[PDB]
Amino acid sequence: HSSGLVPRGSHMSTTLAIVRLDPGLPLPSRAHDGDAGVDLYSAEDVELAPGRRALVRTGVAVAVPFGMVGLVHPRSGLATRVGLSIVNSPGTIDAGYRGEIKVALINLDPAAPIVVHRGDRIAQLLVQRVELVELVEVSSFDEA
Amino acid sequence: HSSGLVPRGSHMSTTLAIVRLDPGLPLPSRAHDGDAGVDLYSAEDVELAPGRRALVRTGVAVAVPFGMVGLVHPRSGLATRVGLSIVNSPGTIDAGYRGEIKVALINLDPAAPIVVHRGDRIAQLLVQRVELVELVEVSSFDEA
Amino acid sequence: HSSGLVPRGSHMSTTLAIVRLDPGLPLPSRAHDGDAGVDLYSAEDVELAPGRRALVRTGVAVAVPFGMVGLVHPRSGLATRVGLSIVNSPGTIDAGYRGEIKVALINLDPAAPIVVHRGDRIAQLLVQRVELVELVEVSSFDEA
Ligand SMILES: O=c1ccn([C@H]2C[C@H](O)[C@@H](COP(=O)(O)NP(=O)(O)OP(=O)(O)O)O2)c(=O)[nH]1
Ligand SMILES: O=c1ccn([C@H]2C[C@H](O)[C@@H](COP(=O)(O)NP(=O)(O)OP(=O)(O)O)O2)c(=O)[nH]1
Ligand SMILES: O=c1ccn([C@H]2C[C@H](O)[C@@H](COP(=O)(O)NP(=O)(O)OP(=O)(O)O)O2)c(=O)[nH]1
Ligand SMILES: [Mg+2]
Ligand SMILES: [Mg+2]
Ligand SMILES: [Mg+2]
């Protein structure tokens, strides 16, 4: 009945430890139930003239579980409306990283600068399993 | 023997409900067996001068299963040949979305405009599981 | 005790067959334990003036398992420092592909050209499961 009970269908759902390096920002959350991503905030004010990029602090650190990856995606609304993107998209956040998550925002508009404010939602963070593959070198795919 | 039988190795393979909002376009399909993506069509004719972007209608809506994500990726051929990309790539399609899938195409060529026609394959849609992570705020990764 | 023993927690970890088409380059490896990606090398020297793109040979071919996808992501360091990106990111490598992996590098800097050398780490390759979804066409999401 209350939300502290893990419902049967979410028994196996994983936890992500997070430190709010900038406690002034809300915890990242999912916009709606079942949303793939939790939105990351900007800790900072930044203006991007057309074509410029910035490495923007999000004020969070996370501990992606071993066997998993964090993935930093552009929001579609800002992408379409003003041409905001992420140079290294999808940003790859490794299980072992304990640093601050940073977003390499870029202005892909021709002519209009983008102003981002501290407390704006600038990206989305997903968490997926990844295959930590063992390479097997072969001389031909025949043999494999 | 016939294709209506789910082969043992595909017993668990998931279904994706789709509505062809624009019934004039073929259903998205995989180019070859085991292909990660089904190709999305453009419902529309659009010309992108260098550096410009457009939000292009695909004529489909989908129901990504709960626990899953739809992911909209650029095709590599158009990317290399004419510099076509997707501003918000990888496009994030949430389980709860029942709208039309739209592709934010962008011309990354310097000098040559891209012409897209209705019925062109402009992107690829993948479907993956996602971890709907429960955030656990900690003051340090020690504690976690 | 020795590394030839598959530790219990990695019993199920998957193998990826690889051919070094250019045996002069090291095998792709993970920068640290639990890293999502193995770094791909450039087989070639290439200079990208601002805004230009190139399809760069990596000197490898791989056999992504059936049920899986290879994903080619930008490195964040080069993305931020010099504006290097990948036009079709995330590059989609299909299970059935046995060709050379190629990286569609692009210079997103305004003004400074990027020089890549043979033996530079230019991208990262991830491997994930993918849902080879069966489309089910419906006239409305009601019915589904
Ligand atoms: O390439 C895309 C990406 C998203 N979408 C749709 C589906 C997705 O569930 C919805 C929201 O995507 P984002 O969360 O990336 N956009 P934004 O964060 O700007 O809007 P919202 O506040 O709706 O989450 O937009 C597309 O049609 N095409
Ligand atoms: O970054 C990439 C992406 C793809 N590829 C190769 C492997 C992949 O299986 C193949 C096809 O990729 P796309 O489906 O993204 N390209 P496209 O749709 O233009 O061609 P096709 O008609 O072959 O699917 O191209 C690369 O070598 N590097
Ligand atoms: O969008 C990003 C991407 C990465 N990162 C951090 C987390 C990740 O684990 C770390 C390394 O990312 P890359 O491997 O993509 N960068 P690079 O290969 O340049 O550096 P390294 O040599 O550290 O792997 O950088 C971010 O903070 N934001
Ligand atoms: Mg959103
Ligand atoms: Mg294709
Ligand atoms: Mg790296």
Please tell me the total count of domains within chain B: 1
The C-alpha atoms of residue A123 and residue A42 are separated, in whole angstroms, by 9
Per the structure, the complete domain to which residue B9 belongs is given by 1-129
Is B144 among the domain residues? no
CATH number at residue C10: 2.70.40.10
Evaluate whether C106 touches C52 at the Cβ level (below 8 Å).
yes
For tokens 């993506």, what's the residue? B37
C141: in domain:
no
Nearest of A112, A117, A115 to residue A51 by alpha carbon: A112
* Given resolution (angstroms): 2.0
**Minimum CA–CA partner of B105 in chain A:** A80
Buried b (16+ CB within 10 A) or exposed e, A74-99: bbbebbbebbbbbbbbbbbbbbbbee
In three-state form (DSSP H/G/I as H, E/B as E, the rest C), the secondary structure along A54-90 is EEEECCEEECCCCCEEEEEECCHHHHHHHCEEECCCC
Which helix or strand (DSSP H or E) is residue B91 part of?
Answer: strand B91-94
- The answer to whether position A144 is within a domain reads no
The answer to whether C125 and C40 have CB atoms below 8 angstroms apart is: yes
- How are strands ordered across the β-sheet holding A68-73? A38-41, A121-129, A68-73, A91-94
∠ CA C141-B55-B74 to the nearest 5 degrees?
90
Q: Cα separation of C136 and C110, whole Å?
A: 46
Ion ligand 6: residue ranges with CB closer than 5 A: C 31
CA-only gyration radius of chain A, Å: 18
Chain C neighbors of B110, CB-CB under 8 A: 51-52
Tracing tokens 């792709």 back to the chain, one arrives at C28
**Chain C positions touching chain A (beta carbons under 8 Å):** 10, 13-20, 27-30, 32-38, 61, 63, 68, 73-76, 79-80, 83-85, 89-90, 98, 108, 110, 124, 126-129
Q: What is the distance between the alpha carbons of residues A139 and C60, in angstroms, rounded to a whole number?
A: 11
How was this structure determined? It was done by X-ray
Whether B139 maps to a domain, the answer reads no
Assigned domain for A136 exists: no
Q: Report which of B94, C59, C76, B118 is spatially closest to residue A99, judged by C-alpha positions.
A: C76
Quote the tokens at residue B70: 């739809």
Measured CA to CA, the distance from residue B61 to residue C54 in angstroms comes to 34
Upstream peptide bond of C90 is cis (omega within 30 degrees of 0)? yes
Whether C142 is in a domain gets the answer no
> CA-CA distance, A6 to B28, in Å (whole number)?
37
User: C76 vs chain A: nearest CA distance in angstroms?
Assistant: 5
Structural tokens at position B104: 């934010």
Mutate to test the interface with A, among B135, B138, B140 (most CBs of A within 10 A): B135
